[PDB]
Amino acid sequence: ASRILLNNGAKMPILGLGTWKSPPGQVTEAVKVAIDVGYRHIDCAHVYQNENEVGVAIQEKLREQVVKREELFIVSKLWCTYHEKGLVKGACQKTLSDLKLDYLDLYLIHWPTGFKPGKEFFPLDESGNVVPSDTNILDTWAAMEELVDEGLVKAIGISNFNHLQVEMILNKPGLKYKPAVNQIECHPYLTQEKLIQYCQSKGIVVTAYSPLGSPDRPWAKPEDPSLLEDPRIKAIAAKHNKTTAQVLIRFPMQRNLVVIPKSVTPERIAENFKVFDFELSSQDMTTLLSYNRNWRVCAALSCTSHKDYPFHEEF
Ligand SMILES: NC(=O)c1ccc[n+]([C@@H]2O[C@H](COP(=O)([O-])OP(=O)(O)OC[C@H]3O[C@@H](n4cnc5c(N)ncnc54)[C@H](OP(=O)(O)O)[C@@H]3O)[C@@H](O)[C@H]2O)c1
Ligand SMILES: O=C(O)Cc1nn(Cc2nc3cc(C(F)(F)F)ccc3s2)c(=O)c2ccccc12
């Protein structure tokens, strides 16, 4: 089954295309090839600095009538420097204009931490600590709710929120809309069993990012563990006559997660989609879960003293 029901009553494709690090001169073609071979969900963000080029591809496939807008599920995220009440609508509208959309299907608070507003995405003090904004998760959440009530977004959600931060929103005085999704890092080295059961128990769908362990992350070190080169995972792939990436994509699908592998390589974009025709066993699933080592692609050092940094807390 290709889609999962959200608590806003809409259906979300469980496979989407990631766009973080997709070069602006390549992502248009990447998104066009992806829609041609079946993707109907694209994961975007203003901080990725490529939403205009993503939008060009979306607009072209709509114009070509390859797909209808109702058949696409387009996600974007509010960056940290825009948590302030007065900046949220403009931020969303800039994303909308760049993506050539009149609404988003899902708009996420990208990280629970607000940063000082301005031109800089990572405003720093002279010792390299991020400069916080005094804004809190709950006021930001009300501003997201306003977007729903203005018709600019169909669903709102969060990303990189821990257990206690999710609970903070679920317990918000006057909460009007629950988060639909919590998009978090998740792969066999960061299996997230506690956070996932909590969110799922509450009707919040979980999206897994960096499902392949983000081999193109700009801060990679050779001594880091490598999912795609892990012989243990490679063995499971071989047994199923699939590639290691295919196994790494099907794994979160079977945990009732949405997953958003990034590629700009047309052959891989198609390979990554061919994951609805094979099943990992229970034993495979528990074996992959056993590889957890709480290793994170995404946890910027410059942010670890922010009041709302999410990853001190166990989950
Ligand atoms: N919410 C957030 O904070 C957050 C954080 C991180 C990521 N995300 C989202 O999650 C998406 C996916 O995460 P990610 O970009 O970090 O990494 P990823 O999807 O885990 O890995 C992307 C890397 O894998 C390569 N790759 C793709 N398919 C492959 C295949 N079949 N075989 C071998 N290599 C393959 C890509 O190469 P090519 O592109 O050269 O093919 C690229 O180097 C992002 O792009 C973004 O949309 C969200
Ligand atoms: O953001 C993505 O989508 C990918 C992403 N991840 N990271 C690692 C990060 N670690 C963080 C930690 C916090 C924190 F909440 F923990 F304070 C807040 C914000 C971040 S960004 C980056 O540094 C980054 C830089 C440019 C574009 C995308 C990203």
By what method was this entry solved? X-ray
Q: Whose CA is nearest to atom 17 of ligand 1?
A: 214
Residues in the chain: 315
Site of tokens 């080029």: 53
Q: CA 293: distance to chain centroid? A: 21
Q: 14: which 2 tokens?
A: 């469980």
**How many angstroms separate the CA atoms of 55 and 143, rounded?**
24
Torsion sign, CA atoms 299, 145, 196, 233 = negative
**How many angstroms separate the CA atoms of 245 and 242, rounded?**
8
Q: Which amino acid is at 12?
A: M
48 in catalytic set: yes
In the chain, the number of structural domains is: 1
Q: Domain limits at 248? A: 1-315
Q: 43: which 2 tokens?
A: 């994961």
**How many angstroms separate the CA atoms of 124 and 62, rounded?**
41
Neighbouring CB atoms inside 10 A of 234's CB total 15
Instruction: Report the residue among 111, 185, 308, 311 best suited for mutation to probe ligand 2: largest number of ligand atoms under 8 A from its CB.
Output: 111
In DSSP notation, 21-36 reads T--HHHHHHHHHHHHH
Ligand nearest to C-alpha 246: 1
**Minimal CA–CA distance to 114: which of 141, 89, 90?**
141
Q: CA 123: distance to chain centroid? A: 23
Strands 17-18 and 73-78: unpaired
DSSP H helical ranges for 160-243: 163-170, 193-201, 231-240
Residues 6+ apart with CB under 8 A from 131: 115, 116, 123, 124, 125
**How many angstroms separate the CA atoms of 271 and 265, rounded?**
10
Q: Which helix (H) or strand (E) holds 143?
A: helix 137-149
State the CATH number of the domain containing residue 50: 3.20.20.100
How is residue 115 annotated by DSSP?
Answer: B
Q: Is the CB of 261 under 6 A from ligand 1?
A: yes
Residue 160 Cα: closest atom of ligand 2: 15
Asked whether the beta carbons of 171 and 277 are under 8 A apart, the reply is: no
Q: 298: which 2 tokens?
A: 């995404």
Neighbouring CB atoms inside 10 A of 112's CB total 24
Terminal CA-to-CA distance of the chain, rounded, Å? 29
Query: How close is the Cα of 63 to the center of ligand 1, in Å?
Result: 28
Ligand nearest to C-alpha 183: 1
Q: How far is CA 94 from CA 25, 73, 76, 80, 84, in A?
A: 20, 18, 11, 15, 16
Q: How far is CA 38 from CA 15, 273, 275, in A?
A: 10, 7, 12
